[PDB]
Design a binder for this molecule. Structure first.
Ligand SMILES: C[S@@+](CC[C@H](N)C(=O)[O-])C[C@H]1O[C@@H](n2cnc3c(N)ncnc32)[C@H](O)[C@@H]1O
Length: 182
Protein backbone atom coordinates (compact mmCIF):
# COMPACT_ATOMS: atom_id res chain seq x y z
CA UNK A 1 0.00 0.00 0.00
CA UNK A 2 1.14 3.56 -0.81
CA UNK A 3 -0.10 4.75 2.62
CA UNK A 4 -1.11 3.20 5.91
CA UNK A 5 -4.48 4.97 5.35
CA UNK A 6 -5.42 1.76 3.42
CA UNK A 7 -6.12 0.08 6.76
CA UNK A 8 -8.86 2.62 7.58
CA UNK A 9 -10.72 1.66 4.39
CA UNK A 10 -10.19 -2.04 5.08
CA UNK A 11 -11.75 -1.49 8.55
CA UNK A 12 -14.64 0.49 7.06
CA UNK A 13 -15.44 -2.09 4.39
CA UNK A 14 -15.05 -4.95 6.88
CA UNK A 15 -17.72 -3.36 9.10
CA UNK A 16 -20.03 -1.76 6.54
CA UNK A 17 -19.52 -4.06 3.49
CA UNK A 18 -20.07 -1.64 0.62
CA UNK A 19 -17.38 -2.66 -1.89
CA UNK A 20 -19.34 -4.87 -4.25
CA UNK A 21 -19.37 -6.02 -7.87
CA UNK A 22 -20.72 -3.85 -10.72
CA UNK A 23 -20.38 -0.55 -8.86
CA UNK A 24 -18.93 2.76 -9.93
CA UNK A 25 -16.72 3.98 -7.05
CA UNK A 26 -15.29 7.46 -6.44
CA UNK A 27 -12.49 8.06 -3.96
CA UNK A 28 -12.20 11.72 -3.00
CA UNK A 29 -8.89 12.92 -1.57
CA UNK A 30 -7.21 9.89 -3.15
CA UNK A 31 -3.51 10.93 -2.97
CA UNK A 32 -1.19 8.99 -2.83
CA UNK A 33 -3.64 6.22 -3.69
CA UNK A 34 -3.96 3.49 -1.07
CA UNK A 35 -7.79 3.57 -0.88
CA UNK A 36 -7.74 3.14 -4.64
CA UNK A 37 -5.45 0.12 -4.10
CA UNK A 38 -7.78 -1.35 -1.45
CA UNK A 39 -10.76 -0.83 -3.76
CA UNK A 40 -8.88 -2.69 -6.51
CA UNK A 41 -8.09 -5.62 -4.15
CA UNK A 42 -11.60 -5.98 -2.84
CA UNK A 43 -13.14 -5.82 -6.30
CA UNK A 44 -10.40 -7.95 -7.98
CA UNK A 45 -12.53 -10.27 -10.15
CA UNK A 46 -15.46 -7.88 -10.39
CA UNK A 47 -16.50 -5.41 -13.03
CA UNK A 48 -16.19 -1.87 -11.57
CA UNK A 49 -15.11 1.66 -12.45
CA UNK A 50 -12.76 3.14 -9.86
CA UNK A 51 -12.22 6.94 -9.95
CA UNK A 52 -9.88 8.96 -7.73
CA UNK A 53 -9.99 12.71 -7.23
CA UNK A 54 -7.38 14.82 -5.44
CA UNK A 55 -6.03 18.36 -5.71
CA UNK A 56 -2.56 16.69 -5.69
CA UNK A 57 -1.42 14.68 -8.71
CA UNK A 58 -1.37 10.98 -7.92
CA UNK A 59 0.99 8.55 -9.64
CA UNK A 60 -1.10 6.48 -12.06
CA UNK A 61 -2.55 3.13 -10.89
CA UNK A 62 -3.47 0.64 -13.59
CA UNK A 63 -7.27 0.42 -14.04
CA UNK A 64 -8.00 3.52 -11.98
CA UNK A 65 -9.19 6.80 -13.49
CA UNK A 66 -7.62 9.80 -11.83
CA UNK A 67 -8.96 13.37 -11.91
CA UNK A 68 -6.94 16.23 -10.54
CA UNK A 69 -9.25 18.72 -8.85
CA UNK A 70 -10.27 20.37 -5.64
CA UNK A 71 -13.87 19.51 -4.74
CA UNK A 72 -15.62 22.76 -3.83
CA UNK A 73 -13.56 24.64 -6.46
CA UNK A 74 -12.85 22.65 -9.66
CA UNK A 75 -16.34 21.22 -9.88
CA UNK A 76 -18.76 23.84 -11.16
CA UNK A 77 -21.74 23.54 -8.83
CA UNK A 78 -20.76 24.45 -5.27
CA UNK A 79 -22.57 25.98 -2.26
CA UNK A 80 -16.38 22.77 -15.21
CA UNK A 81 -13.19 20.70 -15.13
CA UNK A 82 -14.02 17.90 -12.63
CA UNK A 83 -17.54 17.66 -14.07
CA UNK A 84 -16.44 17.30 -17.68
CA UNK A 85 -13.80 14.74 -16.72
CA UNK A 86 -16.52 12.80 -14.85
CA UNK A 87 -18.79 13.12 -17.91
CA UNK A 88 -16.07 11.54 -20.12
CA UNK A 89 -15.97 8.56 -17.74
CA UNK A 90 -19.62 8.16 -16.62
CA UNK A 91 -21.56 9.39 -19.68
CA UNK A 92 -25.13 9.15 -18.36
CA UNK A 93 -24.36 7.18 -15.20
CA UNK A 94 -24.24 8.18 -11.57
CA UNK A 95 -21.80 6.93 -8.96
CA UNK A 96 -22.70 4.07 -6.59
CA UNK A 97 -20.14 4.61 -3.84
CA UNK A 98 -18.61 7.93 -2.98
CA UNK A 99 -15.82 7.89 -0.41
CA UNK A 100 -13.92 10.83 1.02
CA UNK A 101 -10.75 10.65 3.06
CA UNK A 102 -10.10 14.37 2.36
CA UNK A 103 -9.06 16.77 5.14
CA UNK A 104 -8.16 20.46 5.41
CA UNK A 105 -4.73 21.43 6.90
CA UNK A 106 -4.93 22.11 10.66
CA UNK A 107 -4.16 25.65 11.89
CA UNK A 108 -3.85 24.53 15.52
CA UNK A 109 -7.00 26.08 16.86
CA UNK A 110 -9.34 23.17 17.48
CA UNK A 111 -12.67 24.97 16.99
CA UNK A 112 -11.56 26.75 13.80
CA UNK A 113 -10.19 23.47 12.42
CA UNK A 114 -13.55 21.81 13.16
CA UNK A 115 -15.47 24.61 11.39
CA UNK A 116 -13.10 24.36 8.41
CA UNK A 117 -13.67 20.61 8.40
CA UNK A 118 -17.43 21.25 8.43
CA UNK A 119 -17.02 23.58 5.45
CA UNK A 120 -15.10 20.93 3.48
CA UNK A 121 -17.64 18.28 4.47
CA UNK A 122 -20.46 20.50 3.22
CA UNK A 123 -18.59 21.12 -0.11
CA UNK A 124 -18.03 17.41 -0.64
CA UNK A 125 -21.66 16.65 0.37
CA UNK A 126 -23.00 19.22 -2.12
CA UNK A 127 -20.89 17.65 -4.88
CA UNK A 128 -21.95 14.12 -3.74
CA UNK A 129 -25.64 14.96 -4.08
CA UNK A 130 -25.13 15.73 -7.78
CA UNK A 131 -23.32 12.49 -8.61
CA UNK A 132 -24.58 9.81 -6.22
CA UNK A 133 -26.84 7.06 -7.58
CA UNK A 134 -30.14 6.27 -5.90
CA UNK A 135 -29.35 3.54 -3.41
CA UNK A 136 -25.74 4.70 -3.25
CA UNK A 137 -23.30 4.76 -0.28
CA UNK A 138 -21.45 7.86 0.87
CA UNK A 139 -18.66 7.86 3.46
CA UNK A 140 -16.99 11.11 4.46
CA UNK A 141 -14.30 11.93 7.01
CA UNK A 142 -14.41 14.98 9.28
CA UNK A 143 -12.94 16.32 12.51
CA UNK A 144 -15.41 15.42 15.23
CA UNK A 145 -16.87 18.38 17.06
CA UNK A 146 -19.75 20.64 17.85
CA UNK A 147 -21.34 20.49 14.38
CA UNK A 148 -20.91 16.79 13.65
CA UNK A 149 -24.39 15.88 14.75
CA UNK A 150 -25.93 18.71 12.76
CA UNK A 151 -24.22 17.28 9.67
CA UNK A 152 -25.33 13.78 10.55
CA UNK A 153 -28.96 14.99 10.78
CA UNK A 154 -28.63 16.81 7.51
CA UNK A 155 -27.43 13.59 5.82
CA UNK A 156 -30.33 11.63 7.38
CA UNK A 157 -32.46 13.86 5.21
CA UNK A 158 -31.14 12.20 2.08
CA UNK A 159 -30.08 8.67 3.07
CA UNK A 160 -32.03 5.86 4.63
CA UNK A 161 -29.41 5.46 7.40
CA UNK A 162 -26.42 7.42 8.66
CA UNK A 163 -23.87 6.10 11.17
CA UNK A 164 -21.01 7.81 12.96
CA UNK A 165 -17.93 5.59 13.35
CA UNK A 166 -15.73 5.52 16.49
CA UNK A 167 -13.43 8.61 16.89
CA UNK A 168 -9.69 8.23 16.09
CA UNK A 169 -8.56 16.91 16.79
CA UNK A 170 -10.25 13.45 16.62
CA UNK A 171 -11.65 12.19 13.28
CA UNK A 172 -14.76 10.18 12.45
CA UNK A 173 -16.45 8.97 9.30
CA UNK A 174 -20.12 9.59 8.54
CA UNK A 175 -21.32 6.38 6.85
CA UNK A 176 -24.42 6.94 4.77
CA UNK A 177 -26.42 4.10 3.27
CA UNK A 178 -29.09 4.02 0.60
CA UNK A 179 -29.33 7.43 -1.01
CA UNK A 180 -33.01 8.33 -1.37
CA UNK A 181 -32.75 12.00 -2.41
CA UNK A 182 -34.49 14.77 -0.44
C1 LIG B 1 -5.07 11.68 4.12
S1 LIG B 1 -4.92 12.15 2.39
C2 LIG B 1 -5.80 10.76 1.66
C3 LIG B 1 -5.06 9.42 1.72
C4 LIG B 1 -5.74 8.44 0.76
N1 LIG B 1 -7.08 8.06 1.31
C5 LIG B 1 -4.86 7.22 0.51
O1 LIG B 1 -5.17 6.15 1.03
O2 LIG B 1 -3.86 7.25 -0.22
C6 LIG B 1 -6.14 13.49 2.26
C7 LIG B 1 -6.16 14.07 0.85
O3 LIG B 1 -7.29 14.94 0.74
C8 LIG B 1 -6.96 15.86 -0.30
N2 LIG B 1 -7.93 16.96 -0.30
C9 LIG B 1 -8.17 17.90 0.68
N3 LIG B 1 -9.18 18.70 0.27
C10 LIG B 1 -9.58 18.27 -0.96
C11 LIG B 1 -10.57 18.70 -1.84
N4 LIG B 1 -11.35 19.73 -1.56
N5 LIG B 1 -10.75 18.04 -3.03
C12 LIG B 1 -9.97 16.95 -3.38
N6 LIG B 1 -9.00 16.51 -2.50
C13 LIG B 1 -8.80 17.18 -1.32
C14 LIG B 1 -5.52 16.25 -0.04
O4 LIG B 1 -4.91 16.82 -1.19
C15 LIG B 1 -4.92 14.92 0.45
O5 LIG B 1 -4.17 14.28 -0.56
Amino acid sequence: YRSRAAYKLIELDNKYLFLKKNKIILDIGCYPGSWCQVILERTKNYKNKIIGIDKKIMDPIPNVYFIQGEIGKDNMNNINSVDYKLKEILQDKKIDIILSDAAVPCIGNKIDDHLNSCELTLSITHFMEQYINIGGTYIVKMYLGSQTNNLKTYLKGMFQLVHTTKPKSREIYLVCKNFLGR
